[PDB]
Each structure stands twice: as C-alpha cells, then as structure tokens.
Design a protein around this ligand. Structure first.
Ligand SMILES: [Mg+2]
Ligand SMILES: [Mg+2]
Ligand SMILES: [Mg+2]
Ligand SMILES: [Mg+2]
Ligand SMILES: [Mg+2]
Ligand SMILES: [Mg+2]
Ligand SMILES: [Mg+2]
Ligand SMILES: [Mg+2]
Ligand SMILES: [Mg+2]
Ligand SMILES: [Mg+2]
Ligand SMILES: [Mg+2]
Ligand SMILES: [Mg+2]
Ligand SMILES: [Mg+2]
Ligand SMILES: [Mg+2]
Ligand SMILES: [Mg+2]
Ligand SMILES: [Mg+2]
Ligand SMILES: [Mg+2]
Ligand SMILES: [Mg+2]
Ligand SMILES: [Mg+2]
Ligand SMILES: [Mg+2]
Ligand SMILES: [Mg+2]
Ligand SMILES: [Mg+2]
Ligand SMILES: [Mg+2]
Ligand SMILES: [Mg+2]
Ligand SMILES: [Mg+2]
Ligand SMILES: [Mg+2]
Ligand SMILES: [Mg+2]
Ligand SMILES: [Mg+2]
Ligand SMILES: [Mg+2]
Lengths: 99, 62, 116, 287, 97, 305, 117
RNA sequence: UAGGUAGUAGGUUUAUUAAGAGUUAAACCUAGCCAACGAUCCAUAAUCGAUAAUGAAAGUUAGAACGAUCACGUUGACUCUGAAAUAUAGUCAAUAUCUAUAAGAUACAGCAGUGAGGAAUAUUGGACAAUGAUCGAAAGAUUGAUCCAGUUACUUAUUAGGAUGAUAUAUAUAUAUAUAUAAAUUGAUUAAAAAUAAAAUCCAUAAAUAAUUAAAAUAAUGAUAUUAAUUACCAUAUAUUUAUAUGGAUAUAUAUAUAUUUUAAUAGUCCUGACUAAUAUUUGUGCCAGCAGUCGCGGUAACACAAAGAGGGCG
C-alpha cells in the first residue's frame, strides 16, 4: 500500500537526504518516483546495484515512514577518539607522550 | 636409522632429503625401514608400469 | 532481554536446517550449552503443503511441542522470555497481549482452540 | 553406486536381476553353484560371488555390509517341511523401492527400475520419489508411469530404416506365397530414405495395413501394437509380498518378504546352502 | 540331535589335546564353528551350532573329538526322562513358536 | 582347491573344432547360439521354447536339467528338436520321459536350482471385484472375507485399494489399449487363484516368530503333570499364540495458534512432559559415520535426520 | 553408545528436572510420620545411644525437616495487592496484568505440585 | 623409592571466617599418624559421558568432534573492588619485542593470517537475515559469540545411463524365410578366450536455455543467493495427479490447419605360489637385477623378480 508524501519530505531525494548514511549518490539508480521507491523490495534493489547495508537501511526507513515513526539519520556506532577499549591504554599513553 | 631403498636404480647422494617409513628389509639384518620413493630428493622409479604407487611412478598419460 | 533466568531458543540440528530447543537457562551460560530445563522444541521451517491443498486454502503449520505447565511455572517465578520465545508463547496462548511490544501490535481469520 | 560393467558375460555365469537374453542363457547353463572340492573360505567366496551378483550388484560392498541385517525373519503356522531360514539374507533389499519395482515387473531389470525412479516416474502414496534407497513400509502403494512399464515389458522399438528393411522382406515373402498359390507390392529402400508417411502409404499387407513393421505409433517409446518382451516367460515370477495391478501399474507393498515352512518369499535363483555360505561370510565380513 | 537341526545341550568335551565347546543354537542361527566341525555337521545334518575349540586345534583330532562328543556327550531328552522318571518338556514346541 | 572356472554349459553341446582364422569365435558363444536357435530377418529367435509367451495359465519356466540343454521346439506344434551333424535342425531320435512326467510344484518353480522359490498365484478380476463389493457394499469384515476366499487380510486390503484405483482410472479413461493388452498377457502367463482348492489357499494361522520363543527352554515337570500351550506361554512370559493370532487378524493437549490475515502459517503446540521433549545435549554425532540416518520428507526429498 | 543401553538407548542427556516444591509439604502426612517415629538403635541405628555422649561443638541430633505450608508459601512469594484499585496509565496497566498472570501461574503450579505428590 | 612423618597424629583455648577443621596465626598439653592390600619419594597424564572406536560379551582403547567438569590466558607472587578473583584488572618483579623513552606500552591459548617446528591440519572471506549476548526509556548501537559461504576426498551419504546389440550387401491373414558373394580385430585352433565388450539402434534424464515461485521471518529486516523447488509457450475452468475445453502467444500454405527451447556421459588403484579370491598363455632376466606381512621366490621350464595377454578384489 502506497503512502502519501508529507510536507517535510515530499520527494524521494528529500527522503534519501533525511535518512542519510550516504543514501545520497543514489538518485541515478532509481529516479525520483515516490511510488517506485516504496513498492520496490530487496531483490529489485540488489538487481539495480545498491549495497547490502544501504538496501537494509532504506527498507527500514520506508517501513518507519509507512508506520509514521520519526525517520532521521541515526548514525552508525563510532570508536572512541583514543581507541577501542582494548587499544586505548597504549594509544592514550602514546598521545600523552606526543603532547 | 638404516633404511632400505626399493626399486631398480635409485638416486640418493650423501645429503639427499629422504622420507622414511616403517617397513623392514627381511634379508638384511639391522635395517627396519624403507625410504618412501615418490617424495623428497629420492625420485620415482623409472619406467615402472606395474604397482606404480608403491614406487614414485606417475601415470604415463599416453 | 533482562534477567538471570531466561526462557530462550538453543539452536540444534545441522547447517541450513535449524531446529530449536526451547530452554530456561542462565543469562551468562552459552547459547547451545546445557541449560536448567528444556521445555520444548521448535522447528521454524513450516510443514510443506500439497499443490491441491494450497489451492483449497490450507495454511502450513510450525510444530512446537512444549511442556505448558512447566513453562507457566517458569514464567511465574520470573524467568523472562526472549523476543521470539515470548512471541511463540503469546501465539500458543500462555502469555497475554501485555507482553506484545510496540513493533508487533489486521483481522483474525482463525481463532485459537485446545483440541485432543 | 557401483558401475555396470560385464554384468552379462558368459565366461562368468553370473545370474543378474534382469530379463536379458544373455542373462537368461547364463541362468540356463549354470546348473548349480559347485561347492565341492573347495575349502570353507573358497565356498564362502563362491557363494558371495553368485548370490551378490543377483542380489544388489549396483550396491557397493561396504554399503551392502552396512545395510546387511543378521536377524532374519520367519512365521510359525501353529497347525512337515523345514523352513529355509537363510534364504532371507537378501530380504532387506526387497524393502528397497528399486527392488520392489523390479519384482512388480514395472522394469526389465533392477538397474532400469533405478533409472526410472531417478527420472521421477515412480510414485509411492502419491508423492513422487527420485531415490532408489527409499524403503517401502507395509501398506505403501507404488506406481510407475504406464508408458515406462510398457517399454520395460515391450519389445525394442525399431529404427525406421530397419523397420523398412523388415517390411521389404515380408513383402517379398508375401509375393512368393501368392506366386506359389497361383502355381498350385514392391518397395525400393534406396529411394525411400526417411519419409515415414510415404512408407506408410506405400505399404499394405493383410497383417499390417499401413504402419511399417516397427512403427504404428512412432511417438510412443515401444513396439507398435504392444507385444511382450522377447524372453519374458522364464523371468515372470509373480511375487508374494507385492499385490500388483498391471492395468494402472500400481502395486501395494503388503509385506516384508518372510520364510514359511514350505518356502521363502525372497525370489532367488540359488539353493539354500549357497545362501547359508553367503550369510556365514557376511556375519564376519569374511574374517 | 534336537529337532533334527542341533545338539541337545551345551556340550564341553575333551578329546586328547583339543578341548571342545559346542553350544546349542536357536533355529536360523547357522553353523558358527571351526571349519572341520562345520564340515562334519554338514554331513551329519546339524543345521545350527555355536562353539569354539581350545588348546590343540589339530584338524584330525578335532574331527575325531567332535563325532565322539556328538555320540557320547549328548543325552536325548527322552533318555534323560526315562532315567530320572520325569516329564521333560520342550517349552518352545509346546508354545508352537 | 579352486580354479577360475569358465562357465561352460553342464549339458553337452557342439564345440568348436577347427575354424577359419578370421572368425575368432568362442565355445560359450557357440553354446549360446545353439540354445537360441536361428534368428529371423525380424530379430526373433523363434525356435527357442522360451521366446514366446504362454497363453495357458501355465508358466513356461526353465527346465535345463530335464531337457538336457536342448531348448529348441517347433513353434507351431511345440514339438522338440535337436542340432544334427548337418547345420539343419530335426526331431530327436529318443523321446524325453523327464519333460513328459513333471510335477505340480516344479511347474511353478521359476529357477531349477532353488525349490523354495515358487510363483504366487494371480487373482481373477471377477474374484477381486466380488471381494471389493463384499468389503464396501455388503460391509463385511476383512477377516471373514479372508476366511471365505483363502487370502491374507493385508493382501485383501491391498486388492481393495487396487480395485478402487482401477475404477478411478476407468472413469478418467486412462487405461489405454496397450496397457489392457499387457494386463491380459500377464494374466495368461500366471496361474489363477482357486478359492476352493485347499492347497492353493493361503495359510491364515501364520503368526511372526518372536525372540523369546526361539531361545529354547526345557522343564523337568513330574511324569504325570500336564503342560499345555498356555503353561509354556506363561513360562516364557508371553501372551498365548492363539491370542497373538487373533490380535493380528483384528489424549494429549494440542493448541493451534491464531491466524491473522497477513501471516502465512499456523503454530501447532502439542503438550510434552519435561525430561522427555528436547534435543538432547552431548548426543552422538552420526553424520561422519556410515551408520548415519537418512530419512525422507513429506515431498519425497531425501533429508538427513 | 555402549553405555546408552542403561538409559534406554538415549544418546545425549537432559538436565535434571528441577523440583517445583523443594521440600516435603505439610500435607504429606506419611513422610512426617516417618520422620517423627522413634529412631532405631543397636546395629542398624541412626543417632546417638542414650548413655553415650557426642562431640562438644557438634549437635547431637540432625536438623529438623522444614515442612512447607504451601498456602503460606503462596502468600509470601505471591502476595495479592493491598492497594486494590490504584491503576492509571497504559504501561502500569500492562505491568499489573503481567503480575496477575505470574500470580496465577505460580499459584497453580504450587497447588498442582502439592496435589500431584 | 622402604621406611616416611614433626603441624607431623590427637587433645585444650584464642584470634580469622558466613561456617567445620593444625587451613592459616598464637599459646599449652598428650605421643601419635601413615606404611609390602605399597607408605613417603620420583616419573608420566587434564578428567569424564547416555561421546567415539572395537569386541560375542566381560572388557580394552581414545578423550579430535558433541556435551559435563577442571585448570590456565607469556612466568611468579601480592593487593583492591566484590556475594564470589591470588581476576586476561591493578601492583611489583621475571622473559622477549615496540616506540613515545615514560614511577611507559605490548604478550593472538578471540578470529583471520605470518614465520618456525612437523609426516600433517584451512580464508588476512560475507552478514548481523536467524539464535543468543552487552548498552539504551525508546529509537537502534555493538557483536571474528553466532550464522553463512571459502580451502582441504579427513569422514559419511546420494548420484556419476538404461533397454536392445555379434556382420555386410545382392536375389526371390502369410510366416521355422532361403540362397549366393564379400569381410571378419588381439590371442588361440578348441572347452582359449578377450567379446555384449565395442560400434550401431530405441528411450529418457542431468546440465544448459527461458519462465515462475517458496522456506529459513516477519510489523519490517534474507548474509547465504545466478537460493531449493516447479514448469517446459503461458493463463483459467471443469471433473477425478491425469484428461479435455477455452483465452491469448506464435508461423508457413490458402482470422485457422499442422507444430512448439535443447540435450550428453566419463575410474582409478592393489593383487593372481600357499596362507588368500584370481588355470589362456607368452616374453625378458638367470641366486643378478629385484621381490617379500609370513613360509619363501631368483643357479635357463620363474604361476613369486620385470613386462604383455587373460583374470580376481575394492572403488
Ligand atoms: Mg546516537
Ligand atoms: Mg599401475
Ligand atoms: Mg531490556
Ligand atoms: Mg580448632
Ligand atoms: Mg596441614
Ligand atoms: Mg601452633
Ligand atoms: Mg606407590
Ligand atoms: Mg600434564
Ligand atoms: Mg587415561
Ligand atoms: Mg574433545
Ligand atoms: Mg580442539
Ligand atoms: Mg588464571
Ligand atoms: Mg602467547
Ligand atoms: Mg599465571
Ligand atoms: Mg586463530
Ligand atoms: Mg617446515
Ligand atoms: Mg544480532
Ligand atoms: Mg567481521
Ligand atoms: Mg587432514
Ligand atoms: Mg562414498
Ligand atoms: Mg591372432
Ligand atoms: Mg537443470
Ligand atoms: Mg603370490
Ligand atoms: Mg585362490
Ligand atoms: Mg611388487
Ligand atoms: Mg619350512
Ligand atoms: Mg623365461
Ligand atoms: Mg610377476
Ligand atoms: Mg593385461
């Protein structure tokens, strides 16, 4: 079932921008067709030639949109500036020595 | 170890890499081993037609 | 999920062909290690229907042999079920709508019943 | 499975499960299996040779050994002759789908039956099977595609040229007969190369109206008006453990073959001593 | 021989060197004995037999010992019954298998 | 002492003597040719006894011991022939008394070397039909039918099953002409089951033999003390043989899950006692052993259990 | 595989089935009677003989068997709410329902166990 | 390894502990305790099963894999927090590498992987889709647990083609068709075979090529994945999987008459004197070359060495 485009994100491109995680640079693989994006599934996306992680994310965000849950770029997890829990002790010491 | 060397003519020097297995040369006393013949510097026995795997001999391939 | 005692699925069987072993276990002990009490089994691959059967309109079944009374007891003493296990229990009719999360939350075709 | 190679040679009088002409001859000229002037081991070996050639030549030795059951089966009548217990050594193979199909006479051989079921023609309780190692339970139907059954029990469908050549000779014989009758319809094969309808149009004998000798329905995989196989009689042994209906080509596997006071239901071309020797061998794996 | 197929009891007999041990057998269980014993049984009509030779396994002495055991070590049930003055039923036969 | 013995016929045949260098013929091949007789332009070995199919309800099984390897009969008259000093065939000088005087049992004995293997009889279609009617319309029990006719109850059930299938095929018009002809030929080949002939009737008191009976026991009862079948059964710790024969002749909470419009499958929950339900821990992996268990699916797919 | 024939040819093991009531109940009268009967002496005796002493620090007898009053146990583990009608909000209602369900199940289980034994 | 033992054996008390106890610490007594049915001492070894192997069984063997228990996370000691730690933590020392040179950091027995050792044991893979685990109110974040694929005949299993098949021409409502010319491989000249083996012939099926649609998972999410499976030009519409009728797909003759993708087959390796299954024979070598589990074989007639032929196992 197709949903309506909202005021905040009325376009496919706008939706892509909203969701993020480098979902931009994906306006060529499918053109700005609202119905097209929503009806399309995983296999179709794979055939077109998108990534696995990107494919997973888009579908999830589509689903959220359908259910009217707030879509936004929940960024992927990042290691600490110093290091991963294991490497910190040494890295931190090195950083201190440098500075 | 005193190892037997089977087959016709062999190729073994005073330093050759050789693999030993646990057979026994029955007529020679005090030698309780065989050099396995396909592997190492010990080469496969030449112009062997019968029982080729028992020596090194590869399949002639027409 | 939370807890020390937890009702969850331990994996069994071979590659590309899982069967599950509904257990109650410690949270710390491993996924396929020996648990406190095995309550039941669960094969996720549904029983395959015939072409004629499909045409008629008969749904596949997922077999879930399960000690009901034991499971209930374990729930009572406060052993939290996993996301899949709790769903299974709800489907059976042990647990209420209370356990259903927001993601789960659609007209019903066939209603539940006990049979022999 | 073990590859088919020299199964029906004459210098080894091995009696295989088949309706082959060479197999028939082997069966004919074997007599018994001679166990005289042999050691115990030698006797056991000769038993193994003969008995396994018939019972599961396609099976590998190790595989066979694994399947081989020591505990034989029997039935007490509780109402005389001595039951042949040890004929049951190869009772376990009749439980197989392939063997059951062969017994039913839905195949010429065990190999052929195996091929049929691989190709997905046999069914057992509706469900189609592509697995010879499938084992029937008592009460299970099994059903071969009727065309394949007909092919198995029918004659070999001739090539067109061969059929035409046969027709030519028949025509000549007919002409000779009519000449003889007078005293007290030709075909040129070189011209008529491969026009089947033309050949049909040409031909008109009393015993075949148009169709060439071997091709009344070329699209069917067997001989013309269906007739039986060239030496079908001496191998048509109707089994006890199967109930058969040749119209539909269905067959109920009703029992696991079992030995009575009179007889065994394991159909074999070997006397009981041979089967005893085989059993002795396979208990110990020839120790 | 019991039922025209096996020996009556489990016999244990010494002939010179060879120590024989021949157990009776349920019907269908074949001849499972030393090759000489087997040969003798085939000729003497014994279908079912288990047993094992200890000490000497001298073929000739086995052959001599085993026939001696058969003739001598065996007692038929009827003879035993007569000696003791009792009924000596075979339970399997009574049952009808 | 065993050699490799080339399997020549036990019976006597015209061996090779000398022959033209190029032909390369073997004695076995010659023997086979002789057995076959001469082959037609068509391909048929007409003179061989065993070529044509019997239309007699009398199976033409093999008697190589009786006819002494001489298989060749004249097709029209079924009279025996031999291979003379010339290549032409002709009648035998001495007649065979073995082929003339043959028993009932040996006519139904497909292989000469195995007396025990015999052919089972074929049921006449009318009889099968009558059985089917009895079971369905008249509503008689299968045991009574078996007693009447002389078949076994599983056999009767199998027959019934086959009859209904045949009827369905006839309704659909699947039973082709070629199939019918084949069925007729098969019927003609095999001997018919007679319901009156006592020797032909199947023995209906055959129970299967258990383990406890086979292991022989003996009891020293007093000389006069009686000891019947019941007593023997009691000693062995079984039910009596008659009772077992009679037996041969003759709950758990299950829930189903709710089915919402979208979801594709139900959830059947059967009850099960704890300590008896699961997949056990530290069981024997049998997959790399040759005693591995291979089952089959509902769709006939081969599946590792 | 050889030793599985002891356990009915059962390869692999289950964990021990865990007793719902972990002591004998008060309703199990026969057990109580057995416990309280005069303990034997002599050859097949249990405790200390009347005349004979026991080690200074140690107790003379064995400790007494705590018989479960099942109703009391139920009350303690699974108390019904005193504030009966205080209930607003969806999450709170859900929690209350869950609690009720847990009460039901554990009550049933214990009572069943008591009856079952 | 024949004597061992001096907190040793036992009693009385105090501390420490949640709590017993020469478990530690302290104090005071008694003279014990263990041992040739093996003490003390040394050496070796992670232990075990409803696991695996083998046996008729009692047993014996393994302890890879599945699971349960222990101990360790380069070596040794101690401390802190804690219900529980001599923690893969911290402290100090020991050994060996890193820079950043500092009352530094690291230690792959986590996963890949490298060098070494060795007869010998894999990818510097993909995904969090499933099942678990940690954090979070949730949104969802992490996850070399895990699930998947990769390499490796290490193991097991299923397939890895069936039926017919001994010649080639030429002549002339029946039917044993019959003559004639030609040819015919390695052996061998008859019980010496190789050989129904080939080649042909009939019939499929895999793979391919197209179309379709699961299931592992549902609220949605599928790494595996050119997924398994099914159909053979697709769909609907009747009956009981088969059969027929429609709708459209298609192409030549002159909208409707016959058709409907394609299509195979390929095994080693050991052995043939007896134990030990292998009789069709022949050549070479000449106590040499070589064979051999065991007895033995080779000195011109070698069934044993090296080969051809034929044969027997397992595959
Ligand atoms: Mg964030
Ligand atoms: Mg070779
Ligand atoms: Mg939580
Ligand atoms: Mg103290
Ligand atoms: Mg101490
Ligand atoms: Mg002190
Ligand atoms: Mg000691
Ligand atoms: Mg150690
Ligand atoms: Mg050990
Ligand atoms: Mg292990
Ligand atoms: Mg390991
Ligand atoms: Mg540690
Ligand atoms: Mg290290
Ligand atoms: Mg340490
Ligand atoms: Mg690693
Ligand atoms: Mg190296
Ligand atoms: Mg996850
Ligand atoms: Mg990774
Ligand atoms: Mg390896
Ligand atoms: Mg294999
Ligand atoms: Mg030649
Ligand atoms: Mg394919
Ligand atoms: Mg030899
Ligand atoms: Mg031999
Ligand atoms: Mg050699
Ligand atoms: Mg000697
Ligand atoms: Mg020579
Ligand atoms: Mg040689
Ligand atoms: Mg050769």
């Amino acid at each position: 079932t197709i949903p309506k485009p909202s005021d905040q994100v009325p376009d496919v491109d706008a939706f892509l921008n909203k969701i993020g995680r480098n979902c931009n640079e994906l306006k060529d693989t499918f053109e700005n067709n609202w119905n097209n994006l929503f009806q399309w599934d995983s296999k179709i996306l794979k055939e077109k030639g998108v990534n696995i992680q990107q494919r997973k994310y888009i579908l999830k965000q589509v689903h959220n949109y359908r259910n009217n849950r707030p879509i936004h770029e929940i960024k992927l997890g990042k290691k600490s500036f110093f290091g991963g829990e294991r490497k910190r002790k040494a890295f931190t010491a090195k950083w201190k020595a440098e500075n | 170890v005193s190892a037997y060397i089977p087959g016709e003519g062999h190729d073994a020097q005073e330093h050759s890499i050789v693999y030993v297995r646990g057979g026994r040369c029955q007529d020679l006393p005090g030698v309780k081993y065989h050099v396995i013949r396909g592997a190492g510097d010990l080469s496969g026995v030449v112009n062997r037609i019968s029982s080729r795997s028992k020596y090194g001999a590869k399949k002639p391939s027409k | 999920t939370c807890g020390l005692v937890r009702i969850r699925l331990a994996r069994f069987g071979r590659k590309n062909s899982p069967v599950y072993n509904i257990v109650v276990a410690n949270s710390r002990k491993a996924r396929d290690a020996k648990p406190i009490e095995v309550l039941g089994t669960y094969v996720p691959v549904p029983s395959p229907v015939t072409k004629r059967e499909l045409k008629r309109g008969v749904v596949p079944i997922k077999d879930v042999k399960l000690d009901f009374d034991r499971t209930k007891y374990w729930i009572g003493v406060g052993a939290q079920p996993s996301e899949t296990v709790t769903k299974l229990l709800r489907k059976a009719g042990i647990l209420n709508d209370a356990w259903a999360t927001s993601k789960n939350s659609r007209k019903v075709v066939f209603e539940r019943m006990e049979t022999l | 499975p073990r590859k088919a190679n020299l199964l029906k040679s004459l210098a080894r009088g091995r009696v295989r499960t088949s309706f082959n002409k060479y197999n028939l001859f082997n069966l004919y000229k074997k007599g018994g299996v001679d166990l005289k002037s042999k050691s115990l081991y030698q006797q056991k070996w000769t038993a193994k040779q003969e008995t396994r050639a018939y019972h599961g030549e396609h099976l590998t030795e190790k595989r066979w050994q694994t399947v081989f059951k020591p505990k034989l089966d029997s039935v007490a009548q509780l109402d005389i002759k001595e039951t042949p217990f040890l004929l049951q050594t190869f009772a376990v193979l009749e439980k197989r789908l392939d063997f059951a199909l062969f017994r039913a006479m839905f195949a010429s051989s065990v190999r052929q039956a195996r091929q049929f079921i691989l190709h997905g023609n046999v069914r057992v309780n509706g469900v189609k099977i592509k697995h010879p190692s499938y084992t029937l339970k008592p009460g299970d139907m099994f059903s071969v595609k009727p065309d394949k059954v007909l092919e198995a029990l029918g004659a070999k469908k001739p090539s067109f040229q061969e059929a035409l050549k046969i027709d030519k000779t028949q025509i000549v014989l007919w002409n000779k007969y009519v000449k003889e009758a007078k005293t007290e319809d030709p075909i040129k094969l070189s011209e008529l190369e491969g026009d089947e309808p033309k050949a049909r149009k040409l031909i008109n004998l009393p015993w075949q109206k148009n169709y060439v000798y071997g091709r009344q329905d070329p699209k069917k995989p067997f001989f013309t008006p269906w007739k039986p196989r060239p030496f079908l009689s001496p191998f048509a042994i109707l089994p006890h453990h199967l109930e058969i209906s040749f119209k539909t080509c269905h067959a109920v596997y009703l029992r696991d073959p079992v030995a009575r006071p009179g007889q065994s239901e394991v159909i074999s071309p070997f006397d009981v001593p041979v089967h005893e020797r085989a059993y002795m061998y396979y208990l110990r794996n020839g120790k | 021989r019991y039922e025209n197929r096996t020996i009556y009891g489990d016999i244990d007999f010494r002939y010179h060197g060879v120590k024989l041990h021949l157990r009776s057998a349920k019907p269908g269980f074949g001849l499972r004995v030393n090759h000489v014993i087997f040969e003798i049984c085939e000729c003497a009509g014994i279908k079912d037999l288990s047993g094992k030779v200890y000490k000497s396994r001298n073929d000739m002495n086995i052959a001599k010992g085993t026939i001696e055991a058969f003739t001598k070590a065996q007692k038929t049930l009827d003879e035993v019954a007569l000696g003791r003055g009792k009924k000596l039923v075979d339970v399997r036969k009574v049952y009808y298998s | 002492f065993s050699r490799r013995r080339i399997a020549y016929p036990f019976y006597p045949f015209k061996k090779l003597g000398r022959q033209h260098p190029k032909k390369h013929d073997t004695n076995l091949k010659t023997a086979m040719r002789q057995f076959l007789g001469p082959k037609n332009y068509k391909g048929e070995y007409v003179m061989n006894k065993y070529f044509t199919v019997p239309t007699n309800h009398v199976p033409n099984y093999i008697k190589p011991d009786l006819e002494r390897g001489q298989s060749l009969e004249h097709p029209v008259t079924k009279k025996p022939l031999q291979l003379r000093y010339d290549g032409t065939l002709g009648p035998p000088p001495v007649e065979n008394k073995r082929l003339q005087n043959i028993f009932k049992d040996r006519l139904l004995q497909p292989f000469p070397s195995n007396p025990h293997c015999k052919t089972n009889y074929v049921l006449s279609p009318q009889l099968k039909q009558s059985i089917f009617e009895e079971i369905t319309v008249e509503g008689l029990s299968a045991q009574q039918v078996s007693q009447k006719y002389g078949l076994k109850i599983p056999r009767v059930e199998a027959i019934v099953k086959l009859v209904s299938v045949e009827n369905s095929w006839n309704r659909r018009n699947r039973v082709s002409s070629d199939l019918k002809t084949m069925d007729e030929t098969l019927y003609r080949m095999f001997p018919v089951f007679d319901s009156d002939a006592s020797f032909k009737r199947e023995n209906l008191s055959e129970i299967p033999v258990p383990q406890k009976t086979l292991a022989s026991r003996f009891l020293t009862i007093a000389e006069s003390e009686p000891f019947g079948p019941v007593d023997a059964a009691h000693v062995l710790e079984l039910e009596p043989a008659v009772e077992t024969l009679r037996n041969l002749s003759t709950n758990t909470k299950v829930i189903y899950g709710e089915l919402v419009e979208g979801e594709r499958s139900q959830y059947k929950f059967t009850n099960a006692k704890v300590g008896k339900v699961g997949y056990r821990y530290g069981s024997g992996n049998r997959d790399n052993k040759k005693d591995r268990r291979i089952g089959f699916n509902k769709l006939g797919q081969m599946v590792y259990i | 595989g050889k030793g599985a024939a002891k356990y009915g040819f059962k390869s692999g093991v289950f964990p021990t089935t865990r007793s719902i009531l972990k002591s004998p109940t008060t309703k199990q009268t026969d057990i109580i009677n057995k416990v309280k009967s005069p303990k034997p002496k002599g050859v097949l005796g249990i405790g200390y003989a009347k005349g004979v002493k026991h080690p200074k620090g140690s107790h003379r007898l064995s400790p007494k068997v705590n018989f479960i009053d099942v109703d009391n146990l139920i009350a303690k583990t699974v108390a019904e709410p005193q504030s009966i009608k205080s209930s607003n909000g969806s999450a709170q209602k859900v929690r209350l329902q869950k609690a009720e369900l847990r009460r039901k199940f554990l009550i049933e289980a214990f009572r069943k166990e008591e009856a079952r034994l």
